[PDB]
Amino acid sequence: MENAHTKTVEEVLGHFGVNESTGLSLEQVKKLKERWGSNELPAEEGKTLLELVIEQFEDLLVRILLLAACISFVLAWFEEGEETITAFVEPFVILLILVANAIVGVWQERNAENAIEALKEYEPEMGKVYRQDRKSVQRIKAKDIVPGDIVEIAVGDKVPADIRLTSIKSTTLRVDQSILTGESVSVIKHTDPVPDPRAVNQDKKNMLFSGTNIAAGKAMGVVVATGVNTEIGKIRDEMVATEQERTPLQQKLDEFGEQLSKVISLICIAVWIINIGHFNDPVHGGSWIRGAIYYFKIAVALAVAAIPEGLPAVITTCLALGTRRMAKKNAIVRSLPSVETLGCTSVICSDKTGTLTTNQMSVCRMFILDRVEGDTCSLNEFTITGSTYAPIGEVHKDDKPVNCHQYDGLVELATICALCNDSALDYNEAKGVYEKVGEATETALTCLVEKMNVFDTELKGLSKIERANACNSVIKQLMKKEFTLEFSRDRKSMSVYCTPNKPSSMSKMFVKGAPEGVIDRCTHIRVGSTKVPMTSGVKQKIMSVIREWGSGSDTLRCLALATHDNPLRREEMHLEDSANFIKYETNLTFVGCVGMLDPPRIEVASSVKLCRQAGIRVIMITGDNKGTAVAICRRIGIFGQDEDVTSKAFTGREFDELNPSAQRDACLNARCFARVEPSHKSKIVEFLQSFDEITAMTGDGVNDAPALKKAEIGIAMGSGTAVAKTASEMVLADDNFSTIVAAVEEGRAIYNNMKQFIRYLISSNVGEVVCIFLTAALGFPEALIPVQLLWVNLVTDGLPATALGFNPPDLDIMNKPPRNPKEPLISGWLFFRYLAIGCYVGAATVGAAAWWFIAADGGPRVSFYQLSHFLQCKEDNPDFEGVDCAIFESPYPMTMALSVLVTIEMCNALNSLSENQSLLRMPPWENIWLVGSICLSMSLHFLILYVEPLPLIFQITPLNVTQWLMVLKISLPVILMDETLKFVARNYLEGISWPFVLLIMPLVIWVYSTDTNFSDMFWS
Ligand SMILES: [Ca+2]
């Protein structure tokens, strides 16, 4: 109750009214369930809306527009009160794009958070308990655990709640409690109650802390506190403390963000400086102060246009899309920017079991020795059907279903399988399919015994529930176990001491482990029902079939099973160190060996092939035999079926017996590792990083945390420990290897979408800057006023720019070598692409304005000289006759310049679906969000042109069809010019959608029906 570690185990059982064996009764469970509450903590939402919005407005670029909106508001404080929605339009069209980007970023970020949270509940924490529903060990959800329930634990199996250890079945318990209180030291558990009711957590040597992890051993006990009463809900705080650790790309964008603002501020100053002369013009009012304020309004309005204020919104949108796509693929991304650096992965080191294989181990081949003939002998190679845990199948000698009792070896072999077994088979009635409780290898033996049915028990009339534990139950009733020995790494075996139930003592100490260790530690054969000494001939024959089973095209993991005919008594047994265990299993009697298949997932074979296609090296690191590991590598495609592996396959011992000069060169070439220990996994990361490589190490255990932290990218496991998850940048809920390759592909797509966004705004907004500077050089009248410049920013830098975050993945996204973070964000060739497009956009806007002045049917025919010197327009001027000075302030040239600038940048947005794929390969409807944004932006432009009260505000006027065709005649070639730029990059630097082509051909022909050209160019 209050002081759990003060009362005796019998006392706590009596207080709860529960027995260890039978467990809590159904009435007891339902009483306690509604009395205390479910074993869960009150989970709060991640971020509130207000703090989510403030996060949108914290970058430099967005904050700059907040200042410029404030400047434009205070600058418009000369005609106030009387004017309401006329002068204050300039601040409004700056805040409009700010909230348009913020809402999209907030909407996407909320959607990404929701996708993760639904994935958390998709796989529930599952706990093993004993109840009155069924006698055998059963699994229940962790949230359904109520105090007082008897709960068993094993290796791994994250502790559900505070439990009072009733008995320690294993020899020793290793528990890591650093996740909760920070003490990494392993603590020896015991049943002695702590005298101090307020004992320090360090003194708590008998409590399994809630939410912690168990390194090794199995224990039994009763849960005392569930949910809020656990110290994981009281002692710890909210733990709202995360470190961004800015991605090398994020540091680049911040550096590019500040570098751009320095360049933009220099340009906007230059606009003011190069416009000193036009300060005393009569249009400004004849006062120099008013002249210096108007051109300052252009200076800030150009800054609002030129600065890419959508950069924070498109990065958040791109990352949130990447996270949501991963959550749909059952992959939790803890830190949002980390999904970007996955695209940069160059080496993927992954464990074999669980990640590269389904971990659905099932016995398919097994053999026992038939007879011995001189040096050689004979075998009984059996084939057994059934690739799942369901205990249905028949054994085949060659093709015939064989009786169990026909062979004395089979019945003896099943006893070793069943008695040395530590797992069991559980029938999940909720899903209707059998499930494993414990190690997969051990559970495979359990269903093997049920299939054989050595005792020939009548299985026809038995229920489905008892099908799982029918043969194991009867075989254990006749023949019981006393105690077991812990499986140690050096021994590579696990043994058990047993004594028959009936008073015969015919005690046999069964063994089980790796074929190499067991065979070398046995000196006899149980040929049927007789003992035969081990010779040199049977040395090779047993090894020959095992290597054939393992190294063969079926990839069998074998386990030699033997018996200790004359074991030592428990008086001389020592349970202190692994040294005792290795010398306690000698002169064993080999009876036979089994074989389990671990089938690689169907999609793993293709994913490994795709990684080699994208330039990603895949390394498989496993504790399996080297011969088996190489065969499994060849099976999935890491190694070719006829490839030399004399320098790519390294074992743990082989790696260690090398000088560091060869070790470094080994990691450059090595593609698989076998029989390693957690010290090597961190060593491999260090050697790969020394090569300037981005590694994605896969780990699930507590000892893998140093490897995951040192790795550039750490990927945990859904069924793994909690310590690895908190030290990883990604968690695979589905425990699938192919999702790693999908994450790399998505990370590459996220980077490309930012490059398209940067390309679109830099190449378009530099054209806006060129327009103002080219006009000043040519002496032409002003092309755009501040409210027209701010409208172009709202239309062309807002939703159309952000929609590039939803771009479809590129065609050859996975056909190129991984990106190097060392190279700069923008290459030299991309600067040429930005300038070339921007140069045309700027020249198009000036040319469109001069088109109306010079060669327009509906306007005057002012020559180039009279336009380049329009400030000399005088009635008495000898070279100015037939043109009035009022025509140089008409809104047609500004509407011609505005509409071209908007439209030519909408067409440029169509060029930004891919860096090098033409519009023919990718039609614009691949990105339906972009097409919708383009249509909305053009709809907005038409709204302010042909709605009566609006054009006065923006100082523009409606355009007829003849002028609109000229807008399209100049805007369209930005597509053609960029297609040439893409074509040069496609071919000279290193499929056509016919329905799209036949759709735009009528458009191009109709637009290019007539043509108008200029004349008398003197200075240009
Ligand atoms: Ca802008």
Ligand SMILES: [Ca+2]
């Ligand atoms: Ca723009």
